[PDB]
Amino acid sequence: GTILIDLSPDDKEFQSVEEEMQSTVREHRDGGHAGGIFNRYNILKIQKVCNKKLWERYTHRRKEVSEENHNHANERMLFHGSPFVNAIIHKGFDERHAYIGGMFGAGIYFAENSSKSNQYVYGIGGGTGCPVHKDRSCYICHRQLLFCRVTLGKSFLQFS
């Protein structure tokens, strides 16, 4: 059910997504171990993910949350990195593959910092890096992130 629509670099929607990706890079306490050493990205492609059933699944849940929270879904746009992005875009996120070992227990994790999500593209802690060169700081291999609409509703605040 999923189709991918390529955005033109001249499209303001491409531009605003790229700005969010670029502007939320930061340095990491691992000195680049997991995600690589970089200050910016070369954006190769930005595709809209179009799937009517997955969208309706989202908006159904969003309305449920909103109704439980004074008509406030508390919707954010956040990054997600993992080796499973190609499954996610076809089948949706599935909490049965939740990050069992995350800081906040077994759920599905998102970041404001694109560079945080980048640390997970090749696996937890960057795994062994890119499949071709086994390099977590590979500058050659193409990487993929999702930029996702996320319903937070009433969020539990964990200082950490």
Binding site: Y41, K48, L54, Y58, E95, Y99, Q144, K154, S160
Partner: protein
């Protein structure tokens, strides 16, 4: 896992690294939609 009772997500606020942004966890896959797929390279600092 489930969200904490009376909550729909968790927000991980940074308490050490002053420059880190927040991280978030949801416990239901239906609470996120993958709007954009971004293909990229990281760039070697000049």
């Amino acid at each position: 896992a489930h969200s904490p009772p009376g909550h729909h997500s968790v927000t991980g606020r940074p308490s050490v690294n002053g420059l880190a942004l927040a991280e978030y966890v949801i416990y239901r896959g239906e609470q996120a939609y993958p709007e954009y797929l971004i293909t990229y390279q990281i760039m070697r600092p000049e």
